[PDB]
Amino acid sequence: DICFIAGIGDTNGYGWGIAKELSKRNVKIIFGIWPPVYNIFMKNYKNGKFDNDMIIDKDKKMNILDMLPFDASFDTANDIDEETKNNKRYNMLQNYTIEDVANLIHQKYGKINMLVHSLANAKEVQKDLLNTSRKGYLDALSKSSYSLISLCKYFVNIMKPQSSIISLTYHASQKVVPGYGGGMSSAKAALESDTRVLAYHLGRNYNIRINTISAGPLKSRAATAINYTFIDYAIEYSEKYAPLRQKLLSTDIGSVASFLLSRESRAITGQTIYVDNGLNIMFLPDDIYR
Amino acid sequence: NEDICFIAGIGDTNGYGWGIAKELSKRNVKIIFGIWPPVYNIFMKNYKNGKFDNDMIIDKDKKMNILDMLPFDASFDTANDIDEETKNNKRYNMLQNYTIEDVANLIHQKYGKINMLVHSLANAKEVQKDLLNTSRKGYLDALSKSSYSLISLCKYFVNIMKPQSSIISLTYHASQKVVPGYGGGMSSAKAALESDTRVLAYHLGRNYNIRINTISAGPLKSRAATAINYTFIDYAIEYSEKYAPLRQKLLSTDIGSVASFLLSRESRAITGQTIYVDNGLNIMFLPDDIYRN
Amino acid sequence: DICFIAGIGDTNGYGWGIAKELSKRNVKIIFGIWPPVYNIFMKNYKNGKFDNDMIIDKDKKMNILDMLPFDASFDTANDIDEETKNNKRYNMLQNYTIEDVANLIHQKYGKINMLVHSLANAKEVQKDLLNTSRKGYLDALSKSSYSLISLCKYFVNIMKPQSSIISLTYHASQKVVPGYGGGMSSAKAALESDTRVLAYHLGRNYNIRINTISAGPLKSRAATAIYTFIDYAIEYSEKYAPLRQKLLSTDIGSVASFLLSRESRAITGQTIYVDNGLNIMFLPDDIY
Amino acid sequence: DICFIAGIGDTNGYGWGIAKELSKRNVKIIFGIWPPVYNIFMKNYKNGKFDNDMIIDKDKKMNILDMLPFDASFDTANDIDEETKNNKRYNMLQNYTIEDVANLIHQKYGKINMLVHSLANAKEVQKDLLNTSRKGYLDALSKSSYSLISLCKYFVNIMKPQSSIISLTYHASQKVVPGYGGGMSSAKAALESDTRVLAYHLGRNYNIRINTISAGPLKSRAATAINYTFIDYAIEYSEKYAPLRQKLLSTDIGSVASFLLSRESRAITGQTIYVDNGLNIMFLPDDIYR
Ligand SMILES: NC(=O)c1ccc[n+]([C@@H]2O[C@H](COP(=O)([O-])OP(=O)(O)OC[C@H]3O[C@@H](n4cnc5c(N)ncnc54)[C@H](O)[C@@H]3O)[C@@H](O)[C@H]2O)c1
Numbered sequence A, D: 001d002i003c004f005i006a007g008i009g010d011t012n013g014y015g016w017g018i019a020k021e022l023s024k025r026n027v028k029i030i031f032g033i034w035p036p037v038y039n040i041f042m043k044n045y046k047n048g049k050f051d052n053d054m055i056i057d058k059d060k061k062m063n064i065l066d067m068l069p070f071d072a073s074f075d076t077a078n079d080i081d082e083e084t085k086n087n088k089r090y091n092m093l094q095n096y097t098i099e100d101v102a103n104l105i106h107q108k109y110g111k112i113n114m115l116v117h118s119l120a121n122a123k124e125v126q127k128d129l130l131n132t133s134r135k136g137y138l139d140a141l142s143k144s145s146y147s148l149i150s151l152c153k154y155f156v157n158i159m160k161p162q163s164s165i166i167s168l169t170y171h172a173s174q175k176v177v178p179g180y181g182g183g184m185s186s187a188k189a190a191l192e193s194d195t196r197v198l199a200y201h202l203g204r205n206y207n208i209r210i211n212t213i214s215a216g217p218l219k220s221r222a223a224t225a226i227n228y229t230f231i232d233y234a235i236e237y238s239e240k241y242a243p244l245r246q247k248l249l250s251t252d253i254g255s256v257a258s259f260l261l262s263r264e265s266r267a268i269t270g271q272t273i274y275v276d277n278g279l280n281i282m283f284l285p286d287d288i289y290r
Numbered sequence B: 001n002e003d004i005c006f007i008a009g010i011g012d013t014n015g016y017g018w019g020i021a022k023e024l025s026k027r028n029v030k031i032i033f034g035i036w037p038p039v040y041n042i043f044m045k046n047y048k049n050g051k052f053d054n055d056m057i058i059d060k061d062k063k064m065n066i067l068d069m070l071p072f073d074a075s076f077d078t079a080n081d082i083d084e085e086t087k088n089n090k091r092y093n094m095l096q097n098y099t100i101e102d103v104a105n106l107i108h109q110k111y112g113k114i115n116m117l118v119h120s121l122a123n124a125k126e127v128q129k130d131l132l133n134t135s136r137k138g139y140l141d142a143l144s145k146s147s148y149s150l151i152s153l154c155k156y157f158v159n160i161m162k163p164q165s166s167i168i169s170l171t172y173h174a175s176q177k178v179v180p181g182y183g184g185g186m187s188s189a190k191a192a193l194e195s196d197t198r199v200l201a202y203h204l205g206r207n208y209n210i211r212i213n214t215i216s217a218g219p220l221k222s223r224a225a226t227a228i229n230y231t232f233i234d235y236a237i238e239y240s241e242k243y244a245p246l247r248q249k250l251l252s253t254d255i256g257s258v259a260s261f262l263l264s265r266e267s268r269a270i271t272g273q274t275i276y277v278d279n280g281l282n283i284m285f286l287p288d289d290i291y292r293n
Numbered sequence C: 001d002i003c004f005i006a007g008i009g010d011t012n013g014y015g016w017g018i019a020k021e022l023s024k025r026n027v028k029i030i031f032g033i034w035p036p037v038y039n040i041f042m043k044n045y046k047n048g049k050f051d052n053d054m055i056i057d058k059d060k061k062m063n064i065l066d067m068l069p070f071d072a073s074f075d076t077a078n079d080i081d082e083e084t085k086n087n088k089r090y091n092m093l094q095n096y097t098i099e100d101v102a103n104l105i106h107q108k109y110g111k112i113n114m115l116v117h118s119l120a121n122a123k124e125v126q127k128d129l130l131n132t133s134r135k136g137y138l139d140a141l142s143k144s145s146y147s148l149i150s151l152c153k154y155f156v157n158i159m160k161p162q163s164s165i166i167s168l169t170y171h172a173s174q175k176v177v178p179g180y181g182g183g184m185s186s187a188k189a190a191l192e193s194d195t196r197v198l199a200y201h202l203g204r205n206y207n208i209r210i211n212t213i214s215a216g217p218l219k220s221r222a223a224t225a226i227y228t229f230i231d232y233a234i235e236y237s238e239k240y241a242p243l244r245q246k247l248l249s250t251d252i253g254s255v256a257s258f259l260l261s262r263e264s265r266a267i268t269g270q271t272i273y274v275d276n277g278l279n280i281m282f283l284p285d286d287i288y
């Protein structure tokens, strides 16, 4: 049981919660870390900054097999642009394209069992969809949607039959969340549809499964960066109006992904699964209702 | 405390209830069967003749463990709802406490409060009839037995369940897309069960911190399935094994594994949901003939 | 073109709005009027109380072909219960069952081509779903959902091919609306599913189309009989729907009239939202 | 009432069917024609090759207000690349960018009432999703999805009160259609999501409505160019298994588009309306049951 988790930058996101929960099941875990934060992550980890965040309970802490620099906007080394080659954080680093990381993992560890796509990006997220530029829009689809397909395409050859693949989405794909701008809504819409199409292909040709988890709000780094703030309203609305009022943890999403990545979920594929305390089911805020 | 599950809708070892039972016991969850009185005795005779002994094996070193088996009719909420004919029925008279209220109270006396509840049952007298030609009594019977029964079970079991408890039912994709042959208001009853799962999840969540979901299952050759009007169930299985993204035979235990996950605390942020456990066949639009190789 | 419109009690509901819009397209309209309110309706009509409400524009007035008593609880006269036999409001009336009304319409005007189901009922609507009784839930399904099926079964043989059928639903079927109790949510969910299954059977065997309009909130008599629920619903919708305009009964009538016509002949089994776009929204807008 | 129809390259598509049904309600019609096929269209039209296809009934025939070159690849003139600029079919054409045509329509005809998006393109449609390149994918999203956004953005300030917008999508967005490759599934998924997001911003800022029609299969030039071929299979299945067994015509979609573009439909926005003889509602083939 080896899982590659792409899209860990710190201990505050969904990627860390998935790591944690899978570690609970003695899955070996490999982090794919975006190069602009790689060296920072590695320093904090080496200086024990996350040690407390690695604790599960009395007698298991997390065990991280490897941490690799990983940029899912580049499929192969030939795709790396000149702007990126001329960026100091990327220059120390090698083998950070989807193809390169897949080759490295395979040669180093052999075939793996699970894959987590826990990343997204969009230059113009601050702009509403109507005022998003073409370049901004396509950047969102490239980083947040296409990335999954290419990840699947390069990883299928290094995954065993009956492996499982997970991505994270948001309900803004399906119902309007003002503030979820820059084509991110569009990108999550595509990702949930592509999950179906990929499940057909991965199912039939590889007996590999793929699903997506539509998560509720978490104050991760990426979330707080959208412009108190958007995420703060989102959390507070969720905790007020969700069927289950308890605070939503990265690790609640971690448990469901760990189930979807295991053979326990073997008759589930191509699905969007809501791990959001049931908020998605509500139509009207509850205020007046006695 | 400790995990105890009531599974309403076990009439033999060939249905989803038994798969859920088997997967729950795998996880050392205590399990009580709710068995429809018309088939209660036949079930109890086979269980003691050892006829389920082989179906009860989990593996070389594990066997299922059944805490209790009770007569249960989800047609009746209380004793006073029991009609004249059923009273005169000899399959029912030597059996007591089989109304929804009664079985809850009985379970709560013998064992105290439970953690888990599975609704694994449906009935519809005119299932063989198309929806357009299904009578009012036919339609209301389907809704009564397959949809309202879940609501009543919830209502009565809510006060004998611990907080953080979980509830599941089973549904079929016929609710959302047209399956001819799924007659007699069964389609309508699953549509309602899926809608009711959401509304119940709101009320159960806010007031008791209890979760409820439904599993939309692919085809299984259960006793009931073979009672639908080749036969319906054989085409469904054959079609699904041919056209689903995943070609494996769908097993009751595949539903049971997912059920046990939804019933456990690993799914604590999931509620009100319809979860597809059907090898991904729901995601397909057209048959795959021209395209495949 | 002749349309039977089941579920008119007054000018303030969706049925009247549909009637108004159909009459705009020269469709002849037959009202199915629930017996409790039949007398009152015919009295008010006779004394000219609906005369302003019948004007479409200054060159066109609604024309109403007939007004027939109608209770969708009863498939045949054999189904009428003792309580109803003790109701004077019914004892003075005839041919109000689904079977009888279809026969009467067919005997009187021949085959028709449009049918509108604009009705619902549930005795325990004030009770949340969890504390709704079996009798109450089944009542909601019987009156609000099964009634569509039976209306279809009885009208199919007095309808021409290329006919069209419409009912009204609410988004409580698909997303939680607290206060929409009694199993009304369950009934709308069943109606939307049955709309698909009926579309298949009616499509292949009769070349007949059937769809459901999911309407936004309107301050009808039945709505008010449920802040109050309906004023909350309306305020929220007007606060948050993509479109600010007040939702009018005739905005539904306009879509119903399109769906009932040949212009929508490639559309069947569909739930069409006519609600100022409210259904698309996730979160309140305020801070944004 | 004036409608601009983006995506008519011949009389065999849904664009033509919409133009026909709108002309039937005396709407004035402007075509946005892709420059690569603009000349041949103008030749064919000028020679009478479309006269029979312009016949509506006994006494009415289509009346076209204008026919303009138009490429939804380019938002403004500054976006046009040098290869395109030198291409023979572009270098005598002008004002064919999204912004330029909007401004041309405006000064030529004043403000308009209706806008139809009836285009799609994807350079790698013959490749299944998993095997689609990043560039192909983004090209599908750029031409088939982002273009709607850009059309909206440049047109809103040239639209009259009570204006309405439609585009055309396909059910492969929601359920798997093998063969609908190249990220077209993805693009249609984006389009349907974006239709909701646009409906919100357009409704609240401009009281403008936008919907999408999910059409059944039509033997158009674009459909034939995909691939039993893909389209012949799709039509055969639709005609055998739809609740309504009848040939699906471009005017069937035209009729719905006309409605949605009109004031009869003013309480409808952000929706995906299925015009497919009810095929979308079916689960499995019908063979056994009958
Ligand atoms: N946080 C929430 O409230 C929430 C809700 C719904 C969905 N999601 C989704 O969960 C996933 C993770 O988000 P999160 O909140 O955990 O954010 P996060 O900041 O913790 O993780 C996002 C990660 O993406 C990485 N990344 C960005 N661009 C990349 C690129 N081009 N190549 C490789 N990596 C890149 C960043 O380094 C970062 O570590 C995303 O898909 C997000 O859209 C989050």
Ligand SMILES: NC(=O)c1ccc[n+]([C@@H]2O[C@H](COP(=O)([O-])OP(=O)(O)OC[C@H]3O[C@@H](n4cnc5c(N)ncnc54)[C@H](O)[C@@H]3O)[C@@H](O)[C@H]2O)c1
Binding pocket: B008, B009, B010, B011, B012, B014, B015, B016, B017, B035, B036, B039, B072, B073, B074, B075, B119, B120, B121, B122, B123, B145, B170, B171, B172, B173, B216, B217, B218, B219, B220, B221, B222, B223, B224, B225
């Ligand atoms: N078999 C399938 O392919 C399939 C597919 C989708 C959903 N489901 C659902 O799974 C659930 C169980 O079906 P199954 O396939 O295991 O068949 P099954 O024959 O094993 O289960 C049906 C059970 O319902 C019980 N029952 C019927 N009426 C009852 C009543 N009034 N009161 C109490 N019990 C009653 C019977 O004892 C019977 O054992 C049902 O809800 C069904 O709709 C089954």
Ligand SMILES: NC(=O)c1ccc[n+]([C@@H]2O[C@H](COP(=O)([O-])OP(=O)(O)OC[C@H]3O[C@@H](n4cnc5c(N)ncnc54)[C@H](O)[C@@H]3O)[C@@H](O)[C@H]2O)c1
Binding pocket: C006, C007, C008, C009, C010, C012, C013, C014, C015, C033, C034, C037, C070, C071, C072, C073, C117, C118, C119, C120, C121, C143, C168, C169, C170, C214, C215, C216, C217, C218, C219, C220, C221, C222, C223
């Ligand atoms: N008003 C709204 O906000 C709204 C919103 C969404 C959906 N709807 C739906 O639209 C339809 C019409 O409702 P409305 O709000 O216009 O209310 P309404 O009060 O105008 O119409 C309800 C009618 O149903 C009739 N009725 C009740 N029981 C009947 C029976 N057994 N047989 C025949 N008629 C019977 C009543 O006489 C009444 O005239 C209903 O299905 C309702 O659920 C209404």
Ligand SMILES: NC(=O)c1ccc[n+]([C@@H]2O[C@H](COP(=O)([O-])OP(=O)(O)OC[C@H]3O[C@@H](n4cnc5c(N)ncnc54)[C@H](O)[C@@H]3O)[C@@H](O)[C@H]2O)c1
Binding pocket: D006, D007, D008, D009, D010, D012, D013, D014, D015, D032, D033, D034, D037, D070, D071, D072, D073, D117, D118, D119, D120, D121, D143, D168, D169, D170, D214, D215, D216, D217, D218, D219, D220, D221, D222, D223
């Ligand atoms: N034909 C079907 O069975 C079907 C089914 C569902 C949806 N649709 C959708 O309907 C719409 C119309 O398709 P159609 O089948 O009528 O095919 P079509 O060949 O008539 O339409 C495509 C048109 O778009 C033009 N075009 C392509 N790229 C362009 C761009 N760069 N800028 C401007 N114009 C461009 C082409 O010249 C062509 O005329 C598309 O969005 C399509 O996806 C079609």
Ligand SMILES: Oc1cc(Cl)ccc1Oc1ccc(Cl)cc1Cl
Binding pocket: A119, A120, A121, A122, A123, A125, A169, A170, A184, A216, A217, A218, A222, A223, A226, A231, A234
């Ligand atoms: O998808 C999300 C949804 C929410 Cl409610 C919060 C954070 C999310 O994640 C992102 C949002 C925008 C960008 Cl640009 C990148 C990421 Cl990771």
Ligand SMILES: Oc1cc(Cl)ccc1Oc1ccc(Cl)cc1Cl
Binding pocket: B121, B122, B123, B124, B125, B127, B171, B172, B186, B218, B219, B220, B222, B224, B225, B228, B233, B236
């Ligand atoms: O729901 C089901 C779906 C399938 Cl594919 C097969 C069997 C099913 O179960 C039933 C079907 C009809 C009746 Cl009357 C009772 C039951 Cl338990």
Ligand SMILES: Oc1cc(Cl)ccc1Oc1ccc(Cl)cc1Cl
Binding pocket: C119, C120, C121, C122, C123, C125, C169, C170, C184, C216, C217, C218, C222, C223, C226, C230, C233
């Ligand atoms: O469905 C409805 C939805 C809304 Cl928002 C308002 C009124 C509605 O109509 C009804 C609601 C309950 C009952 Cl018992 C009967 C009817 Cl006619």
Ligand SMILES: Oc1cc(Cl)ccc1Oc1ccc(Cl)cc1Cl
Binding pocket: D119, D120, D121, D122, D123, D125, D169, D170, D184, D216, D217, D218, D222, D223, D226, D231, D234
């Ligand atoms: O969307 C469509 C759906 C179908 Cl069934 C047939 C044709 C369609 O339209 C297209 C499909 C692919 C490309 Cl590249 C361009 C276009 Cl216009």
Ligand SMILES: [Cl-]
Binding pocket: A127, A128, A129, A177, A178, A179, A180, A181, A182, D197
């Ligand atoms: Cl936005």
Ligand SMILES: [Cl-]
Binding pocket: B129, B130, B131, B132, B179, B180, B181, B182, B183, B184, C197
């Ligand atoms: Cl049926």
Ligand SMILES: [Cl-]
Binding pocket: B199, C127, C128, C129, C130, C177, C178, C179, C180, C181, C182
């Ligand atoms: Cl309620």
Ligand SMILES: [Cl-]
Binding pocket: A197, D127, D128, D129, D130, D177, D178, D179, D180, D181, D182
């Ligand atoms: Cl594909």
